[PDB]
Amino acid sequence: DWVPPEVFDLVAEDKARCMSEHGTTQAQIDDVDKGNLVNEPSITCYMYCLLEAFSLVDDEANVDEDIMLGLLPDQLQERAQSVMGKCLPTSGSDNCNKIYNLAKCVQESAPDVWFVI
């Protein structure tokens, strides 16, 4: 990955909170990173939780595309922008399910783009 060790420091406090709130295990996170994701609230609500902590989504899981693209390396932004044209706006039954659907769409469309810390 292009994700540097810094980001792990930066997200540590929110990561710990989000996992505690939702019953998330590190194994579930590792799985999403390997492209294995199911619609289980303990992982889908974790992803919403962390996105929200960094202002990447609002109260109804609408994505701030400019902030999201801003997370990614310059060299990935062209292809990520195409992916967001396909996968946004979000849709689903609740905030966690919206992020499930988004993650599945990004992972299906682009290898290097969705990542979960």
Ligand SMILES: CCCCNS(=O)(=O)c1ccccc1
């Ligand atoms: C392309 C967006 C990735 C979303 N993954 S994440 O929810 O773990 C997350 C990563 C980094 C900051 C906040 C949330």
